[PDB]
Amino acid sequence: AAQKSFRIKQKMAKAKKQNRPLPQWIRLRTNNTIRYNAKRRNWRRTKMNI
Amino acid sequence: GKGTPSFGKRHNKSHTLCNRCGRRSFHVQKKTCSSCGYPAAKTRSYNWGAKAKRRHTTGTGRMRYLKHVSRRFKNGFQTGSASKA
Amino acid sequence: AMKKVEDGNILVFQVSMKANKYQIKKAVKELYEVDVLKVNTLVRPNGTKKAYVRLTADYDALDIANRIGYI
Amino acid sequence: AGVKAYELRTKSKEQLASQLVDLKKELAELKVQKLSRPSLPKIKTVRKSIACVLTVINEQQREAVRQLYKGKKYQPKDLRAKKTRALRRALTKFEASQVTEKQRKKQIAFPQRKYAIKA
Amino acid sequence: SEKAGHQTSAESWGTGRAVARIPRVGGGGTGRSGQGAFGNMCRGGRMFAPTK
RNA sequence: AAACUUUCAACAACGGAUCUCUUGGUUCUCGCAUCGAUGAAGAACGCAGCGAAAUGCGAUACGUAAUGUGAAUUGCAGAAUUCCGUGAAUCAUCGAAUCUUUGAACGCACAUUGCGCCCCUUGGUAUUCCAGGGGGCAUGCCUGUUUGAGCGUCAUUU
RNA sequence: CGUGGAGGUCAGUGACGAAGCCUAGACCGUAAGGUCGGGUCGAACGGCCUCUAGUGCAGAUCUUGGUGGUAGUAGCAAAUAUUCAAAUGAGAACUUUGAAGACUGAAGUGGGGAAAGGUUCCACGUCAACAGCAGUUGGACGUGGGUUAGUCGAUCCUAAGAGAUGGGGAAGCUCCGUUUCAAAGGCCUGAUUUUAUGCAGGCCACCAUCGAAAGGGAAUCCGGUUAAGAUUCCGGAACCUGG
RNA sequence: AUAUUGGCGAGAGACCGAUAGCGAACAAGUACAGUGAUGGAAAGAUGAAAAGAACUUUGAAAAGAGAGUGAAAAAGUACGU
Ligand SMILES: [Mg+2]
Ligand SMILES: [Mg+2]
Ligand SMILES: [Mg+2]
Ligand SMILES: [Mg+2]
Ligand SMILES: [Mg+2]
Ligand SMILES: [Mg+2]
Ligand SMILES: [Mg+2]
Ligand SMILES: [Mg+2]
Ligand SMILES: [Mg+2]
Ligand SMILES: [Mg+2]
Ligand SMILES: [Mg+2]
Ligand SMILES: [Mg+2]
Ligand SMILES: [Mg+2]
Ligand SMILES: [Mg+2]
Ligand SMILES: [Mg+2]
Ligand SMILES: [Mg+2]
Ligand SMILES: [Mg+2]
Ligand SMILES: [Mg+2]
Ligand SMILES: [Mg+2]
Ligand SMILES: [Mg+2]
Ligand SMILES: [Mg+2]
Ligand SMILES: [Mg+2]
Ligand SMILES: [Mg+2]
Ligand SMILES: [Mg+2]
Ligand SMILES: [Mg+2]
Ligand SMILES: [Zn+2]
């Protein structure tokens, strides 16, 4: 949809920011259990339903 | 071919985002949220949907104002400020 | 953006979403006492408002660039 | 470093506004360097100074208006007590202890005496 | 707890599909869909004669 | 006779049972009574030197002010004068403030960041046009003020 | 006979190895089972007298999880089809360049769009997984860059319709109804120029709002320009609305 | 004087012990499917301390063989048993 509403574009931007792997230095912190960004999204595997 | 060949035709959205719930359940041709019943005054919730109520009841949000009520009650709603002993 | 400056006499700024062309115009005019020709805006895909500003011939974008402090 | 509230309390409005604009200017000038320099923690002190200065301004203003309405009723809807809803809507002790003439007379006549049973 | 193993909406698939007649959870696409519940033998189902 | 098949044993495999742990859960008892038009519960979007989440926060944005404690935080660099001190801390406490866009949601609407109106102020040679800033404009209801309407009706005029 | 827990007792056992696990090694009982030696391991456990129970598995097309024989088998065969040399690389049928042979044949395998998709676009590095073979390649992975309007659209009007207010039903969430049984207003003109604006006038009956990215509608073209943007930028030349 | 699976603050158990116990001992009402009402998971444990394997050698590289820390690498981030 080339003609899209501002709210949709806002969601677009947020998703684009969220799509990212871990800032690696997290894995060094004390008592860290995080391993990978389990909530990553990909445009071929899981549609947004918005 | 009522199955797979038909499934190719579905490209017109019926529900979109609710200004209140933000769940994409706003049936447009009726102008009504399914989850919130947005245009209506009160929230749309029912007693049989236990999990439904549990997914939205109080305490699952930020409680931007309710969190400090207990603190204020404990301290008796004092006014003024400390005294710098 | 750097190319734009020394070629088009253009400055590039990121501006708060609530701003509008009038507000950018007046703000630049008083922040840098430069005379502005026109303002041209858009929203980048990351949700920030990018504004190109074109200054009249009486001023040099490059000359004020290093004065602002980035070059 | 940064500014300290206790000596900021002493200055007057004009000095405050001038200081605030100086701090904003310094913030922008430091921000522009930040994008080229890989890392630059001096943001924190500047922004906290902004916060402190604005807070001092706000206290000064509200104190002034509080004095201006001091000692007379009907002061604005957000300077009085934000206790609750119910507490605001309940009776104040003045009327809560209001009693009819008949009741007051009867209580004065026959108060509950204080007695004991040993002998 | 009284509500043990019942906070769901399962039901039987009935015969004819070469599976057990245990009631099973609906839905789909989440790994939990299709397993059993409500049974003393089901994983995560209620116990026998819940202690009162 | 080998290979092949089968059984058992040692070692190496696949798999995570068993054993032992537990900041969790479950039930019982005791005490307390505190949400919201001064804008609640809830939602969206944003905020960090280096962040995706959880947690915290609202353009004063992992926070400001106030009090107490009295030397840190930590994954890396930085800050150190703040160390016999109106003073570190993602500390504790918490009475002062900010509180984006929303939300019963309140100028009119909303699949839009749409369209109004009033007051004060600033510039554009301006009461009328354009623009910037600040403050305003819901409904039902109660008491009161002010202005009204009806041959419903009273008196008084010529 | 055995199991999870409880009261008592053996001043019970143990980092000089408790619990568990393996052992065609041993002993005891008809059995349920118990006991020992050897290896492995690393932190608690047992006997006896009593108490209590969510207490003993082969099955239930049982439930969850795991793994086989089948088997390196079925198979990987529509859309006419590929070939030579060089370059790159450890590696080349599958990457690039050149050379050749081909097809789509303008109701195209071409050039743009609407619904939807949401960074796939473009650049740099890179191949653990994905592209049911390969892979130096990619719509994959990692780090970044990129979308510019007075004139293109939305917003503006109304259609089929939806829907407040005045009102009337219903115990009630709420239902009807759209100019309806309503006291449903703003408009010009001047006046005063203390002065904001009532005080002078006259006018007018309909009477909210939403509802089209293909209906109605004010206005822009040409050349050039990037890795990616253009009727949006640059250059030149115009037009509309409001004052 | 009585009720109370909600809220807030406390105290306990002949309760369960990671397929049990709330569904959730973890970034759980999250990941995920459905237009929607709704449906809804899996996943706890190296070691006292990272001391998380310097250096050599074969390999394009992943890796391997040595060397080394550790009481143990029959603990090597595919980490107790
Ligand atoms: Mg259709
Ligand atoms: Mg439809
Ligand atoms: Mg634009
Ligand atoms: Mg054996
Ligand atoms: Mg042993
Ligand atoms: Mg141990
Ligand atoms: Mg049983
Ligand atoms: Mg069995
Ligand atoms: Mg049997
Ligand atoms: Mg079976
Ligand atoms: Mg064959
Ligand atoms: Mg074959
Ligand atoms: Mg075939
Ligand atoms: Mg044609
Ligand atoms: Mg195209
Ligand atoms: Mg393959
Ligand atoms: Mg391969
Ligand atoms: Mg591409
Ligand atoms: Mg209606
Ligand atoms: Mg319209
Ligand atoms: Mg034209
Ligand atoms: Mg293009
Ligand atoms: Mg031009
Ligand atoms: Mg060992
Ligand atoms: Mg071990
Ligand atoms: Zn909703």
Swiss-Prot record, chain A:
Where mainly located? cytoplasm
Q: Which UniProt keywords apply?
A: Cytoplasm, Ribonucleoprotein, Ribosomal protein
Question: What are the GO BP annotations of this UniProt entry?
Answer: cytoplasmic translation
Which domain of life does the protein's organism represent? Answer: Eukaryota
- Localisation: Cytoplasm
| Pfam families in the cross-refs | Ribosomal_L39 (PF00832)
One cellular component term (GO) for this entry is: cytosolic large ribosomal subunit
Q: Where is this region: Disordered?
A: 1-21
Its assembly, as annotated, is: Component of the large ribosomal subunit (LSU). Mature yeast ribosomes consist of a small (40S) and a large (60S) subunit. The 40S small subunit contains 1 molecule of ribosomal RNA (18S rRNA) and 33 different proteins (encoded by 57 genes). The large 60S subunit contains 3 rRNA molecules (25S, 5.8S and 5S rRNA) and 46 different proteins (encoded by 81 genes). eL39 interacts with YIH1.
Protein name (database record): Large ribosomal subunit protein eL39
UniProtKB/Swiss-Prot annotation, chain B:
Q: Any other noteworthy remark?
A: Present with 21800 molecules/cell in log phase SD medium. There are 2 genes for eL37 in yeast.
Segments forming C4-type zinc fingers: 18-36
Per its Swiss-Prot or TrEMBL entry, what cofactor is needed? Zn(2+)
Annotated Zn(2+) binding lies at 18, 21, 33, 36
Q: Which SUPFAM superfamilies match?
A: Zn-binding ribosomal proteins
Q: Its Gene Ontology biological processes? A: cleavage in ITS2 between 5.8S rRNA and LSU-rRNA of tricistronic rRNA transcript (SSU-rRNA, 5.8S rRNA, LSU-rRNA); cytoplasmic translation
Superkingdom of the organism of origin: Eukaryota
Task: Identify the InterPro entries for this entry.
Answer: Ribosomal_eL37, Ribosomal_eL37/eL43, Ribosomal_eL37_CS, Ribosomal_zn-bd
Say yes or no: keyword Transcription present.
no
Q: What is its main location?
A: cytoplasm
Q: Name one GO cellular component term.
A: cytosolic large ribosomal subunit
Give the coiled coil ranges.
Answer: none
What GO molecular function annotations does the UniProt record carry, in alphabetical order? RNA binding; rRNA binding; structural constituent of ribosome; zinc ion binding
Q: Report the protein's function.
A: Component of the ribosome, a large ribonucleoprotein complex responsible for the synthesis of proteins in the cell. The small ribosomal subunit (SSU) binds messenger RNAs (mRNAs) and translates the encoded message by selecting cognate aminoacyl-transfer RNA (tRNA) molecules. The large subunit (LSU) contains the ribosomal catalytic site termed the peptidyl transferase center (PTC), which catalyzes the formation of peptide bonds, thereby polymerizing the amino acids delivered by tRNAs into a polypeptide chain.
Keywords from UniProt, A to Z, are: Cytoplasm, Metal-binding, Ribonucleoprotein, Ribosomal protein, RNA-binding, rRNA-binding, Zinc, Zinc-finger
Cell compartment(s), UniProt: Cytoplasm
**What detail does the entry give on cofactor binding?**
Binds 1 zinc ion per subunit.
* UniProt-listed Pfam families: Ribosomal_L37e (PF01907)
Keyword match Cytoplasm: yes
Tell me which family the UniProt entry assigns to this protein.
Answer: Belongs to the eukaryotic ribosomal protein eL37 family.
From Swiss-Prot, chain C:
> Which part of the complete sequence is present?
72 to 142 of 142
The yes or no answer to whether the keyword Ribonucleoprotein is present is: yes
One GO BP annotation here?
A: ribosomal large subunit assembly
- In Swiss-Prot or TrEMBL terms, this protein is called Large ribosomal subunit protein uL23
User: Belongs to which family?
Assistant: Belongs to the universal ribosomal protein uL23 family.
Q: Partners and quaternary state?
A: Component of the large ribosomal subunit (LSU). Mature yeast ribosomes consist of a small (40S) and a large (60S) subunit. The 40S small subunit contains 1 molecule of ribosomal RNA (18S rRNA) and 33 different proteins (encoded by 57 genes). The large 60S subunit contains 3 rRNA molecules (25S, 5.8S and 5S rRNA) and 46 different proteins (encoded by 81 genes). uL23 is associated with the polypeptide exit tunnel.
Q: Which GO terms describe its molecular function?
A: RNA binding; rRNA binding; structural constituent of ribosome
Q: Which UniProt keywords apply?
A: Cytoplasm, Isopeptide bond, Ribonucleoprotein, Ribosomal protein, RNA-binding, rRNA-binding, Ubl conjugation
- Show the GO cellular component annotation of the record: cytosol; cytosolic large ribosomal subunit; preribosome, large subunit precursor
User: Can you name the source organism?
Assistant: Saccharomyces cerevisiae (strain ATCC 204508 / S288c) (Baker's yeast)
The subcellular location is: Cytoplasm
UniProtKB/Swiss-Prot annotation, chain D:
Q: Cellular location of this protein?
A: Cytoplasm
Keyword Methyltransferase attributed: no
Q: What GO MF annotations does this protein's record show? A: mRNA binding; structural constituent of ribosome
Q: Which GO terms describe its biological process?
A: cytoplasmic translation; maturation of LSU-rRNA from tricistronic rRNA transcript (SSU-rRNA, 5.8S rRNA, LSU-rRNA)
As stated in the Swiss-Prot or TrEMBL entry, residues carrying the post-translational modification Phosphoserine are 12, 49
Keywords from the UniProt entry: Cytoplasm, Phosphoprotein, Ribonucleoprotein, Ribosomal protein
* Alphabetized SUPFAM superfamilies for the sequence: Ribosomal protein L29 (L29p) (SSF46561)
Q: Which InterPro entries match?
A: Ribosomal_uL29, Ribosomal_uL29_CS, Ribosomal_uL29_euk, Ribosomal_uL29_sf
Q: What Pfam families does this protein's entry cite? A: Ribosomal_L29
| This protein's GO CC annotations | cytosol; cytosolic large ribosomal subunit; preribosome, large subunit precursor
Indicate yes or no for the key word Cytoplasm. Answer: yes
Major localization class: cytoplasm
| Record note on quaternary structure | Component of the large ribosomal subunit (LSU). Mature yeast ribosomes consist of a small (40S) and a large (60S) subunit. The 40S small subunit contains 1 molecule of ribosomal RNA (18S rRNA) and 33 different proteins (encoded by 57 genes). The large 60S subunit contains 3 rRNA molecules (25S, 5.8S and 5S rRNA) and 46 different proteins (encoded by 81 genes). uL29 is associated with the polypeptide exit tunnel.
Q: What else is known?
A: There are 2 genes for uL29 in yeast.
Q: To which protein family does this belong?
A: Belongs to the universal ribosomal protein uL29 family.
Q: What is this protein called?
A: Large ribosomal subunit protein uL29A
Q: What is the lineage of its organism?
A: Eukaryota, Fungi, Dikarya, Ascomycota, Saccharomycotina
Corresponding gene? RPL35A
